[PDB]
Symmetry: D2
Subunit: 369 residues, 4 copies
């Protein structure tokens, strides 16, 4: 089988965004929460790992102990001035150096560690240590610009791991498939004029960054044709996503011939996420991972790396990620999703489904069909 | 004069140890934070903001008086009420489909129901011009013999049958803009022409898989039930068009003597239990559409009854703009989500699909 | 008539992301539940229980009047107040020792203080016979220029100084039965004989390591400060003897024109921030001692001001019985812990020890 | 000090007592909690393991996979009828079959799992796979009677582990030192007429079971002299516990000559626990662990097993248990207890200290 590496560190759950009601700073008209503070909560990620323990799936993976990102690693993407300001704010108690990117004292070390998980997953897959990998990163990365953190991302996890890999393995072509429900503006920005990294984002139309769709932003200069935005209307679900993957994502991968596929895996397109309006369920994520596994076996020797990003529904994220992990490792457990049959009843009916198919066919046509 | 019907103990109702709406055990790990989905704070926080803004001081807050056994038995069989009380006395349970409650939840449900009775009664007797009943537990999914979907008693139907007994009211219209289908209201009045039941809801959401546009009543009630399913991901302009093209015309045709809104706030843009895109100004505007209809059709007699709403951070701003509109007051509250939620709204291609969807609903109505 | 002074926004003060009182970072993992130790609910649940019992119906609730900067500057230097406001605008912080606050904590601290000002004002003016101010943030650890121990303004000192300016009251006694030493009150009036400051507190608890029996005032204030430290693990009978043999005799000798009690409820038997064994009826009986003293010494003028109290589940029953005595009102509330808390009380050998300890304090007072 | 087994399972953190405010059942006058429900909360135990991970301590220990207790196991202590009703209620959604022992659907499986942690820890120490062991038990066990669960204890973890050891190794003499702040009434009861298990309990006088002190309850029959209660007054702290251990607990162990020492380790005597009134701090638990390590080394070839019981301060329990684990494993980390200085300042002064010493002097005198 594909021995799957699972990259996690306890301290990633000790990152805390501060006293917010969901994503809202307390202060003014926003009453502080009486329960868990924040939206990126520790349990919105730890509960996935908890469920993988309870099912026994965790014992079927290998869990290496990753070293943190070094300053040299992260400075292949970020300017040292950002990194120095980040560390100094963190040493002094935390803050927010960007757009909705709050952190607490010592958040700098936890982000370097989070980043180390994605570096390690990429490094170990390229070295053959494992056949494929899942990095349970927290804080996430796919919104972080070179000099600006945003949307709960403090470092550019996947870009940093890619740049390390080019330095240590000389890898020529990398494709990033971002199915976190929000646009991967960070990844898009960092490689926008580069043709060696193909950046694909599937995301809810206009959600985050608010108002942005991006299907005509396809790259610049040498990177023209190497960025691919797939916005999908709010309220799209399982059949829409798999059509998008069959008709856009997978052919673009086939065209590009990567030497490595990386999934920026947010789980926030799930049917009860507060931070988006999509209708994916656990089996959606199993099937999308299988398409990525098949593509990687066909294109780059099974070299597939999944890097956790967003996902905010503490009760349902575990089941979506666990089905993903089952696919990735080719293992099956006794876990049954208690929401699955309701999520299937919830899916768009025939009138909405023809609209999603019309919407995706136009994206295809607009790309040169 | 706006009356505001609330009682501290509606916040003491507790659905038990669920992760969101998932009963714990087997593969569901217990929540480390607040248990459940219908949490006390997902309703209390609206009242807290009405206090913090000074709005609540411009409203009249009468003391709650629970529904009686006689009140609730106008709708429910005595056997259900009896099993409910006995299960509650022995520590709680669930007598339906996703309707859990704890010890003493029976009395809290009778108290919650009483808020709706009194809101309707006081408006009909002109003690106040309109009214808002902060019900918890909610009511619009509860069937005559079966509680459902966090609804233990049929709050609005009980209030209506009380109104018929106490005031002899002839025509009532219920407009249910909670994001789930008002199956409880629909069923209880399905064969009656004196109560027009309107439900605007996310297509196929709860009850799961139900759309319902063809279900327009039976017998004497044929033509007096009106389901308006909207697709997941619909937002402000879709709801406005549905009210302009379906809901408000249906009211003008029916000529009610009282309008009740079953007001869930769970169509809000960050709610976990639906996929819709309404924001606080949506609720302000739909409330003004009901105020206008009430002034036009029944001397301004409007009652708003709280049902769902599960985003504890954003529900308060939606319901507070509703309350401003209802009271005709205007506070300093600024919705910190409004700009982003407006940015989130469906773009042209999605907006065209919503408009085509609603146009077809209108057409199907003959 | 008992006036009850409270405002929704006092429950919006947040101390930030701490596990209990431990700032997050380094080896302290963020809490998954409610953050902090001075949590909103550790105070709001007292108000909730008084609504649920009907007791709140029997009291008068004046609208809150925030403290003015002129009020607070009768105790604090203006520079402190300006730095406090600027730090709160910039998003909060901590300007003292264990006194964190979030953005907007300045306004809420000013509100909280206005509750104690008003409660004292309305009793002196005869609008109510006695009063309870549900202050949050608390006040009695705050120094003139240094906030401490969750206390951002010196609520009771400010209230006293407003009272001297508006009414010219001559003699005020403050009885501090919060379980921590009232070091703020002690320091502010230490060289003054017009305010007698008494503090009963767990030996060495907060400020840590302080006992203080020999600290009796200075200059004209000599003999007008009275510390009563009590060993960890003392309970109902120990406190009763301390009040009978020390506190009440000191009130008799002093002849106050007003009694104010700084009532933290953190000496209760399950509080995390102290080791004492008081129960709900302990607070009812200690309030009756203060009521009888006030009746006998100053025409029944008694103000109770909320300080600390951190056991969310049990603080409501302690404060509710206090309010019952304060108002002379009966409810059906029953403390479901009382029998157990009575069984937990120190046995005979410990009780002889507590009696010997208190006898020594009596003797040392000369 | 040694190669230390650490016995934990993720599902022990999935046991939920239900919708209580602290230990008070919601309903009537008790308002539901908005934060974490209950007193025995998952995090009041998990946070110890989380810190042992974050410190790197976990990487120096051995973590065997969990082996649940079998029904045969638990029925060496409990009548099968109790176990079957427990199973039937757990399947039907949970309940409470005793006194303050509530549980949710599937709580039976998790109690069987938790018990297995103690069984395996004892087994592995006796068979020599590890020199000492820590069992992160949840639910706890030391209040559970043979037919009556109580005080958040659904199975008699430590008794069941001792009877398994007897059945599998023939062990003659076991001492249990219960320093959980509450009386170990379950262990006392099960072994009350037996001379082969010396049961020692140090606890807050009159705390739980409420009103109970127990110094004069020394066993019966063949068990006379083989149960030892050390009630301590509420408000006792570090120096009182030290004296109790030097003057009573360690002398008892030396007379009894155990072949195995089991510590029932609740951490609820820490200085901020809601469910007791004691003033222990992290270094108290380190030193008490050293005392038991030295007794195990002198009396039974270092065979020492520490079984988690109570502990309810989710912010401070981790530092107390982490210093415990440092002593058990003999591994140092960079963990610094942020509360320690203050808790030292909190400790009883000279007048209360003299009361605690004469109290303990009185207990020693009554022994004989
Ligand atoms: C403004 C709220 C939108 C979510 C921001 C973080 C998105 C992500 O998880 O990638
Ligand atoms: C999604 C499963 C539960 C839905 C309950 C709907 C209750 C409401 O109308 O607020
Ligand atoms: C860090 C020690 C906690 C004690 C501070 C609380 C003060 C009070 O409630 O009066
Ligand atoms: C009711 C207060 C005490 C609860 C009993 C649990 C004691 C323990 O942790 O052993
Ligand atoms: K690119
Ligand atoms: K994306
Ligand atoms: K209804
Ligand atoms: K509806
Ligand atoms: K009808
Ligand atoms: K003071
Ligand atoms: K005091
Ligand atoms: K003085
Ligand atoms: K004990
Ligand atoms: K024995
Ligand atoms: Zn996302
Ligand atoms: Zn709803
Ligand atoms: Zn205090
Ligand atoms: Zn205990």
């Amino acid at each position: 089988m594909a021995r799957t590496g699972f990259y996690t560190d306890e301290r990633t759950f000790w990152h805390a965004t501060g006293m917010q009601a969901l994503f809202l700073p307390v202060g003014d008209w926003v009453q502080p929460p009486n329960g868990t503070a924040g939206a990126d909560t520790p349990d919105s990620k730890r509960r996935l790992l908890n469920l993988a323990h309870a099912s026994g799936l965790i014992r079927k993976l290998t869990l290496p102990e990753a070293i943190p990102a070094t300053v040299e690693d992260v400075c292949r993407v970020h300017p040292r001035d950002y990194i120095d300001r980040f560390k100094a704010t963190s040493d002094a108690g935390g803050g927010d150096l960007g757009h909705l990117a709050p952190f607490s004292k010592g958040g700098y070390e936890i982000a370097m560690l989070s980043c180390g998980l994605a570096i390690a997953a990429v490094d170990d897959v390229l070295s053959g240590k494992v056949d494929n990998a899942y990095a349970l990163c927290r804080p996430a990365g796919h919104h972080c610009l070179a000099d600006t953190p945003m949307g709960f991302c403090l470092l550019a996890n996947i870009p940093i791991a890619i740049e390390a890999a080019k330095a240590r393995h000389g890898i020529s072509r990398v494709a990033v498939v971002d199915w976190d429900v929000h646009h991967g503006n960070g990844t898009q920005s960092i490689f926008y004029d580069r043709a060696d990294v193909l950046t694909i984002s599937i995301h809810q139309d206009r959600c985050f960054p608010p108002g942005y769709s991006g299907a005509e932003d396809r790259g610049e200069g040498a990177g023209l044709g190497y960025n691919l935005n797939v916005p999908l209307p709010a309220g799209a679900g399982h059949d829409a996503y798999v059509q998008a993957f069959d008709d856009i994502v997978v052919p673009a991968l086939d065209d590009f011939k990567p030497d490595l596929i990386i999934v920026a895996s947010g789980l926030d397109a799930n049917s009860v996420d507060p931070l988006a309006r999509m209708l994916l369920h656990s089996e959606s994520y199993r099937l999308l991972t299988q398409k990525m596994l098949d593509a990687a076996a066909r294109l780059c020797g099974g070299k597939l790396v999944v890097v956790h990003e967003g996902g905010y529904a503490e009760a349902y994220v575990p089941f979506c990620g666990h089905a993903l992990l089952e696919a990735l490792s080719g293992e099956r457990t006794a876990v049954v999703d208690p929401v699955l049959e309701m999520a299937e009843a919830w899916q768009p009916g025939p009138e909405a489904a023809a609209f999603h198919r019309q919407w995706i066919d136009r994206l295809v046509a607009d790309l040169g069909k």
